[PDB]
Structure formats: C-alpha cells, structure tokens
Symmetry: C3
Subunit: 26 residues, 3 copies
C-alpha cells in the first residue's frame, strides 16, 4: 500500500511507484 | 496508513503527514 | 486506503478521494 511521504517538510505529488517532489515541477 | 484528503473538491499535495492545498504553492 | 496512482509516468494529486493529474490544476 502506498506509504506516508518523507517526514521532511517538503510537498510531494504521486507518480507511478514514487512520491516525487512538487519542486521538481514548480 | 495514509488517510484521505478533505472531501472538498480541491487538489492536495502531501507534505510530511499533512494534506496541503496545492493552491498555497501558486 | 489510498490506492496507487495510474502507473503512467504522470504526476497526480489528490482531489477528494481520487487521483487527478497535477497538470489539470496548473
């Protein structure tokens, strides 16, 4: 099942099996 | 287990253990 | 539980209880 995102104070989006940083888009 | 986002029709990103509105980044 | 996003190499965010493409909000 998908896990919690990193406990790192960064926003993530979902892409295939990954949490990916929103800052890679914006 | 990761819980659902608010049932409000808006886009949320995952930031640590919180759903945060995408619009706050825009 | 929140399921996996569509496995297609595109970024998704949560909109209520569904995964919706990030691009649709930008």
């Amino acid at each position: 099942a998908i896990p919690e995102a990193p406990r790192d104070x960064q926003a993530y989006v979902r892409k295939t099996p990954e949490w990916v940083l929103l800052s890679t888009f914006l």
